[PDB]
């Protein structure tokens, strides 16, 4: 049901309806001779859409916008990037050129600039301290603390009980740590516990890569991170 790498030729984007007015977007990138899927989120707000994360690159993000227009037909008016790496901000320039207002926390914007990555236009206030939450249209944005990266945000859709964890939450099939070059391994389990504490009612949990599940993805991610810590 949920699409995988083999259903998505590189350059294409699939959409998957999770609930009324909530979709994930799924795209792929080739890297070091392997192919990786990547998820973002789309949330309806009246007659407009809020986009969470690019589709990992200019080409994929252009295709994302075309697929949204084909299948949903509502304008993407705002986008939020959940951390500074290329799989979340690569494509921001395409969004900006298409008239989408792009957003990230000020920490994300600064780290993106340092990395030479694309930089969302607007700065999201009120997310600088672990445990901070703000409403942004139809979602709540939450800063759980440092995890996969120091700036990583998660997104909750209260109407649908959908929790999008981005790259701070691993799919179940991933049992080894990913790229953790910018991670806070020491704080990551604590940050995951803040997510559990704030969204214990979540029914659908979307990882940054791979298959959705339930809140079981949180403790799974903690297990993987702790195993890596003790490597
Ligand atoms: O977006 C990036 C820029 C990046 C950083 C170091 S190499 C490439 N990497 C993502 C990624 C996904 C699939 C496999 C490897 C990856 O590192 P990420 O670690 O954010 O989830
Ligand atoms: Zn990352
Ligand atoms: Zn603006
Ligand atoms: Zn990622």
Numbering used by the authors: 32 to 262
Paper quotes:
Among the resistance mechanisms, that mediated by metallo-β-lactamases is of particular concern as these bacterial enzymes dismantle most β-lactam antibiotics, which are our widest applied and cheapest to produce antibiotic agents. Mimicking the transition state of β-lactam hydrolysis, they target the Zn ions of the metallo-β-lactamase active site. For further analysis of the binding modes, we co-crystallized 5c, 5d, 5g, and 5j with VIM-2, and determined the structures of the complexes by X-ray diffraction with 1.34–1.92 Å resolution. NMR and X-ray diffraction unambiguously demonstrate that VIM-2 binds the stereodynamic inhibitors with a conserved primary interaction of their phosphonic acid to the Zn ions of the active site.
